Amino acid sequence: PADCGEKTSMAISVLLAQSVFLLLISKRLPATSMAIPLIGKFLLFGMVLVTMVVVICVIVLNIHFRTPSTHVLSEPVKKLFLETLPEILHAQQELFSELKPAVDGANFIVNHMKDQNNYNEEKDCWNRVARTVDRLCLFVVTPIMVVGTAWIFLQGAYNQPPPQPFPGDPFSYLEKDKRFI
Amino acid sequence: KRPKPEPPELREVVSSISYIARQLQEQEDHDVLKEDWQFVAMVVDRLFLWTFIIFTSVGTLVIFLDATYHLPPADPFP
Amino acid sequence: QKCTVAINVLLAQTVFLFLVAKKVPETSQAVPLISKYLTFLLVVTILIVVNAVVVLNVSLRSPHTHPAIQACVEACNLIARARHQQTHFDSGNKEWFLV
Amino acid sequence: FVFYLPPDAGEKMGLSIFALLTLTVFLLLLADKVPETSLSVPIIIKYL
Amino acid sequence: IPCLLFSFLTGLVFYLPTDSGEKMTLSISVLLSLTVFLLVIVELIPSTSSAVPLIGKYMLFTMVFVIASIIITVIVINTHHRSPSTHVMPEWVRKVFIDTIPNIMFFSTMPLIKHPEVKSAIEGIKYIAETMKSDQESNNAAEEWKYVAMVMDHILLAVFMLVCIIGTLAVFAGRLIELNQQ
Amino acid sequence: MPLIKHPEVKSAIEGIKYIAETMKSDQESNNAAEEWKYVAMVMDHILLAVFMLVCIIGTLAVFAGRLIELNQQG
Ligand SMILES: *[C@@H]1O[C@H](CO)[C@@H](O[C@@H]2O[C@H](CO)[C@@H](O[C@@H]3O[C@H](CO[C@H]4O[C@H](CO)[C@@H](O)[C@H](O[C@H]5O[C@H](CO)[C@@H](O)[C@H](O)[C@@H]5O)[C@@H]4O)[C@@H](O)[C@H](O[C@H]4O[C@H](CO)[C@@H](O)[C@H](O)[C@@H]4O)[C@@H]3O)[C@H](O)[C@H]2NC(C)=O)[C@H](O)[C@H]1NC(C)=O
Ligand SMILES: *[C@@H]1O[C@H](CO)[C@@H](O[C@@H]2O[C@H](CO)[C@@H](O[C@@H]3O[C@H](CO[C@H]4O[C@H](CO)[C@@H](O)[C@H](O)[C@@H]4O)[C@@H](O)[C@H](O)[C@@H]3O)[C@H](O)[C@H]2NC(C)=O)[C@H](O)[C@H]1NC(C)=O
- Is A101 exposed, middle or buried (CB count within 10 Å of its CB: 0-12, 13-18, 19+)? middle
Q: How many residues does chain E have?
A: 182
Ligand 2 interacting residues, C-beta cut-off 6 A: B 73, 76-78
Task: Tally Cβ neighbours within 10 Å of residue C33.
Answer: 8
Q: For residues C17 and C23, what is the distance between their CA atoms, to the nearest angstrom?
A: 10
- Of D6, E104, E127, E168, nearest in space to C76 by CA: E127
- Of A52, A41, A56, nearest in space to A15 by CA: A52
- Of A136, A121, A129, nearest in space to A89 by CA: A136
Q: Based on C-alpha coordinates, what's the Rg of chain E?
A: 26
Cβ distance F17 to B17 less than 8 Å, yes or no, reads no
- Of C21, D21, A48, C20, nearest in space to E29 by CA: D21
Report how far Cα E126 is from the mean position of its chain's Cα atoms. Answer: 41
Residue A102 has, within 13 A of its CA and on its CB side, a CA count of: 16
Smallest CA–CA separation between C29 and chain F, in Å? Answer: 43
Q: How far is the CA of E93 from the centre of ligand 1 (A)?
A: 71
Instruction: Give backbone dihedrals phi and psi of C10, rounded to 5 degrees, phi first.
Output: -65, -40
CB nearest B49 (choices: D4, D7, D46): D4
3-state secondary structure of F1: coil
Q: How many residues does chain D have?
A: 48
Q: For residues E80 and F46, what is the distance between their CA atoms, to the nearest angstrom?
A: 42
Chain C neighbors (3+ CB pairs < 8 Å)? E, F
DSSP D7-43: GGG--HHHHHHHHHHHHHHHHHHHHTTS---SSS--H
H/E stretch holding F49: helix F7-73
- CA-CA-CA-CA torsion for A32, A35, A37, A42, nearest 10 degrees? 130
H/E stretch holding A92: none
Report how far Cα E81 is from the mean position of its chain's Cα atoms. Answer: 12
Q: CA–CA distance from F58 to each of A68, F43, F67, F70 (Å)?
A: 49, 21, 14, 19
Q: In a mutagenesis test of the A interface, which of B18, B29, B37 is the best target, namely the one with the most A β-carbons within 10 Å?
A: B18
Residues on chain A touching E121 (C-beta within 8 angstroms): 103, 106-107, 110
Q: Which ligand is nearest to the CA of A160?
A: 1
3-state secondary structure of E128: helix
3-state secondary structure of E19: helix
Cβ distance E110 to C71 less than 8 Å, yes or no, reads no
Q: For residues A51 and A49, what is the distance between their CA atoms, to the nearest angstrom?
A: 5
F3 touches chain C (CB under 8 A): no
Any idea what the Cα angle at residue A80 is, between residues A76 and A82, rounded to 5°? 115
DSSP chain C: -HHHHHHHHHHHHHHHHHHHHTTS----SS--HHHHHHHHHHHHHHHHHHHHHHHHHHHT--TTT--HHHHHHHHHHHHHHHHHHHHHHHHHHHHHHH-
Q: For residues A127 and A170, what is the distance between their CA atoms, to the nearest angstrom?
A: 67
- Of E75, E53, E77, E73, nearest in space to E65 by CA: E73
Helices E116-180 and E2-10: crossing angle in degrees, nearest 10, is 150
Task: Tally Cβ neighbours within 10 Å of residue E150.
Answer: 21
Q: For residues B34 and B28, what is the distance between their CA atoms, to the nearest angstrom?
A: 10
Please give the span between the terminal C-alpha atoms of chain B, in angstroms, as a whole number.
61
- Of E160, E174, E157, nearest in space to E61 by CA: E160
Resolution (A): 2.1
Report how far Cα A83 is from the mean position of its chain's Cα atoms. Answer: 22
D11, A64 contact by CB (below 8 A)? no
Q: For residues A50 and A31, what is the distance between their CA atoms, to the nearest angstrom?
A: 25
Q: Which ligand is nearest to the CA of B75?
A: 2
C-to-N gaps above 2.5 Å in chain B, after residues: 6
H/E stretch holding B32: helix B8-68
- Is E22 exposed, middle or buried (CB count within 10 Å of its CB: 0-12, 13-18, 19+)? buried
Q: How many residues does chain A have?
A: 181
- Residue A15, C-beta contacts closer than 8 angstroms, at least 6 positions apart: A47, A50, A51, A54, D18, D22
3-state secondary structure of A93: coil
F9 touches chain C (CB under 8 A): yes
Kindly tell me the number of DSSP H helices and DSSP E strands found in chain E: 5, 0
3-state secondary structure of A129: helix
Long-range contacts of A108-117 (CB under 8 A, 24+ apart): A108/B21, A108/B24, A108/B25, A109/B17, A109/B20, A109/B21, A109/B24, A109/E124, A109/E128, A110/E120, A110/E121, A110/E124, A110/E125, A110/E127, A110/E128, A112/B24, A112/B28, A113/E124, A113/E127, A113/E128, A113/E131, A114/E127, A117/E131
Residue E124's identity, in one-letter code, is G
Residue A154 has, within 13 A of its CA and on its CB side, a CA count of: 6
Q: In a mutagenesis test of the B interface, which of A59, A71, A112 is the best target, namely the one with the most B β-carbons within 10 Å?
A: A112
B59, D47 contact by CB (below 8 A)? no
Residues on chain F touching C67 (C-beta within 8 angstroms): none
Q: CA–CA distance from C14 to each of A62, B78, D17 (Å)?
A: 35, 54, 19
Q: CA–CA distance from F24 to each of B23, C61, C89, F29, F33 (Å)?
A: 9, 27, 18, 9, 14
Q: For residues E1 and E118, what is the distance between their CA atoms, to the nearest angstrom?
A: 75
Smallest CA–CA separation between F61 and chain B, in Å? Answer: 33
Q: Which atom of ligand 1 is nearest to the CA of A167?
A: 12
